[PDB]
Design a protein around this ligand. Structure first.
Ligand SMILES: [K+]
Ligand SMILES: [Mg+2]
Ligand SMILES: [Mg+2]
Ligand SMILES: [Mg+2]
Ligand SMILES: [Mg+2]
Ligand SMILES: [Mg+2]
Ligand SMILES: [Mg+2]
Ligand SMILES: [Mg+2]
Ligand SMILES: [Mg+2]
Ligand SMILES: [Mg+2]
Ligand SMILES: [Mg+2]
Ligand SMILES: [Mg+2]
Ligand SMILES: [Mg+2]
Ligand SMILES: [Mg+2]
Ligand SMILES: [Mg+2]
Ligand SMILES: [Mg+2]
Ligand SMILES: [Mg+2]
Ligand SMILES: [Mg+2]
Ligand SMILES: [Mg+2]
Ligand SMILES: [Mg+2]
Ligand SMILES: [Mg+2]
Ligand SMILES: [Mg+2]
Ligand SMILES: [Mg+2]
Ligand SMILES: [Mg+2]
Ligand SMILES: [Mg+2]
Ligand SMILES: [Mg+2]
Ligand SMILES: [Mg+2]
Ligand SMILES: [Mg+2]
Ligand SMILES: [Mg+2]
Ligand SMILES: [Mg+2]
Ligand SMILES: [Mg+2]
Ligand SMILES: [Mg+2]
Ligand SMILES: [Mg+2]
Ligand SMILES: [Mg+2]
Ligand SMILES: [Mg+2]
Ligand SMILES: [Mg+2]
Lengths: 155, 73, 119
RNA sequence: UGGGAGAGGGUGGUGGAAUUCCCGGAGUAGCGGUGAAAUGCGCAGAUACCGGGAGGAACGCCGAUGGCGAAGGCAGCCACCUGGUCCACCCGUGACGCUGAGGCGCGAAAGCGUGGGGAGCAAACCGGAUUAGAUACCCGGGUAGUCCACGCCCUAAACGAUGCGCGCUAGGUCUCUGGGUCUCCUGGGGGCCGAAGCUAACGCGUUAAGCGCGCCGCCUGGGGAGUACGGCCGCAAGGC
């Protein structure tokens, strides 16, 4: 992107919750364009969070995401023969991106054999404040901050 | 910029050679005992040069300062 | 353990460090701090953050003697300079005033090569 | 004769800022330094603060695109001694002029001799880094020297890379310094841009690189070579 600033693709609201953030999460889950297989996985998970929990799946979702968003991160830079982890605030658009990506990433690290279960648990497990997705989010924030000395390199 | 007011204008008739008139001479020094430039004193090459000797003269006697502490930064 | 209340804060900024010294109403060191005092070794000390941490370290150790008001004196043109000031104001101490007193000769000693190449 | 501007020169005398060192107070654990670091310095208390003293070297702002000097070069302030110079009046002498081989004097920096001085800086040198390797560039130390007196050396990108004097040939603009009736006029300097013209071109252009006269110095393809030899000068380095 050297000329313009690329406008963000606007997604199609969820087939069930009419939410755009859901389509995203689904997309991230999807691999090899198997959007059907993807969608189902998320949904089955929604029904799994619906059981083991009394709270609505949609709301559990929102929360987890919110909990896994990083508000700070270190972006490496060159300064007179040396690379520095420069803490940088994190763009809202990028937060949602990193959050959704991480959940799925962490989710597939889990031990439970069934996909939907892994998403299910990771998701609810996230809204609880725990889970590997949230640990990544924290390690990142710990990374930033911990280099506040190189913060004057605003970037 | 620098359109505040040339010291010469912001003042009456005076004897540039009077090295003892603190009350007036002092008006030609910055927030720091530094001798103001022509763009600020509105004097001519010749006057400015005389003022210079006059001020340095006072300073030695004890009437004017050589350097003052800045009060802000 | 000597109660002073009001005093002076000397910020010694430079390109390799920022050391702060807090003195009584007439120049005597009550407590001091520096980039190295807080832990940073090497170039880290010069950073403005270090400055902040140092100014704060000084202040906290200052109020221990019941300090509340301070007159700030800044010497140097280092990086921490402005941060250290910011730090103090937000330390709890009252910044009664700020005056820059960096020393400058009216030309005296030949500077070292690294500071010459000048006219 | 009257008056002007100026870091022009020489001699004393003085002022304030800063660095270093020493004394005292108060204060802890570092400081310093770099791309990053070490060497180094610090609990026989450093760094950072405040007070006192000693010493040496230089002179901030003003100070410019400024000023003065034949050149090299000359800036804190005061006094003395002193060179050049510009203007006004048109008063005196009546070419008394220009140039200038030799000669003589002056001549930045480094360097030399004798004796002083020595704070900061710093060839050499001692270390720490960097690097393929650094006899370097960066960092910590540091002697000659840098400063003074007297004597010597006599070189340079000693440059406007343009010898000195005189007369002649549009103007515009800025500026320093005189005199005038002071929008401006008239001198003496410093800069830009430009008539004519000149120039290989770049450029120069009433500070000429134009148009002319006078006198001096110098050039004659590159390398060898500012070398060898000889002479002269110098304590030497070395210079001509
Ligand atoms: K010979
Ligand atoms: Mg440092
Ligand atoms: Mg006369
Ligand atoms: Mg003079
Ligand atoms: Mg002591
Ligand atoms: Mg040690
Ligand atoms: Mg001990
Ligand atoms: Mg002149
Ligand atoms: Mg010259
Ligand atoms: Mg006559
Ligand atoms: Mg006659
Ligand atoms: Mg002659
Ligand atoms: Mg003759
Ligand atoms: Mg000489
Ligand atoms: Mg010499
Ligand atoms: Mg000698
Ligand atoms: Mg040294
Ligand atoms: Mg190499
Ligand atoms: Mg080596
Ligand atoms: Mg060295
Ligand atoms: Mg010469
Ligand atoms: Mg020249
Ligand atoms: Mg000649
Ligand atoms: Mg002109
Ligand atoms: Mg002109
Ligand atoms: Mg040509
Ligand atoms: Mg021209
Ligand atoms: Mg001519
Ligand atoms: Mg010519
Ligand atoms: Mg010849
Ligand atoms: Mg031949
Ligand atoms: Mg030949
Ligand atoms: Mg030759
Ligand atoms: Mg030779
Ligand atoms: Mg001999
Ligand atoms: Mg030679």
């Amino acid at each position: 992107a050297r000329r313009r600033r690329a406008e963000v693709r606007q997604l199609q609201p969820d087939l069930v919750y009419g939410d755009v953030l859901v389509t995203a999460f689904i997309n991230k889950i999807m691999r090899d364009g198997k959007k059907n297989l993807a969608a189902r996985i998320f949904y089955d998970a929604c029904k799994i969070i619906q059981e083991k929990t009394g709270q609505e799946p949609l709301k559990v979702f929102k929360q987890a995401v919110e909990n896994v968003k990083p508000r700070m991160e270190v972006r490496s830079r060159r300064v007179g023969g040396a690379n520095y982890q420069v803490p940088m605030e994190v763009s809202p658009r990028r937060q949602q991106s990193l959050a959704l990506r991480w959940l799925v990433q962490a989710a597939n690290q889990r031990p439970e054999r069934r996909a939907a279960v892994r998403i299910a648990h990771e998701l609810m497990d996230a809204a609880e404040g725990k889970g590997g997705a949230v640990k990544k989010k924290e390690d990142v924030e710990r990374m930033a901050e911990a280099n506040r000395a190189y913060a004057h390199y605003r970037w | 910029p620098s359109r505040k007011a040339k010291v010469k204008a912001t003042l009456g008739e005076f004897d540039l050679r009077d090295y003892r008139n603190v009350e007036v001479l002092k008006r030609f020094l910055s927030e720091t005992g530094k001798i103001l430039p022509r763009r600020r004193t509105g004097l001519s090459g010749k006057e400015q040069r005389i003022l210079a000797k006059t001020i340095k003269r006072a300073r030695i006697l004890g009437l004017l300062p050589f350097t003052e502490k800045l009060v802000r930064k | 353990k000597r109660q002073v209340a009001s005093g002076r804060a000397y910020i010694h900024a430079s390109y390799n460090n920022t050391i702060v010294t807090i003195t009584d109403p007439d120049g005597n060191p009550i407590t001091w701090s520096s980039g190295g005092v807080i832990g940073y070794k090497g170039s880290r000390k010069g950073t403005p953050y270090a400055a902040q941490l140092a100014a704060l370290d000084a202040a906290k150790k200052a109020m221990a003697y019941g300090m509340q008001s301070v007159d700030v004196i800044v010497r140097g043109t280092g990086a921490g300079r402005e941060q250290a000031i910011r730090a103090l104001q937000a330390s709890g101490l009252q910044v009664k005033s700020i005056v820059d007193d960096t020393p400058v000769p009216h030309n005296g000693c030949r500077p070292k090569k690294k500071f010459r190449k000048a006219s």
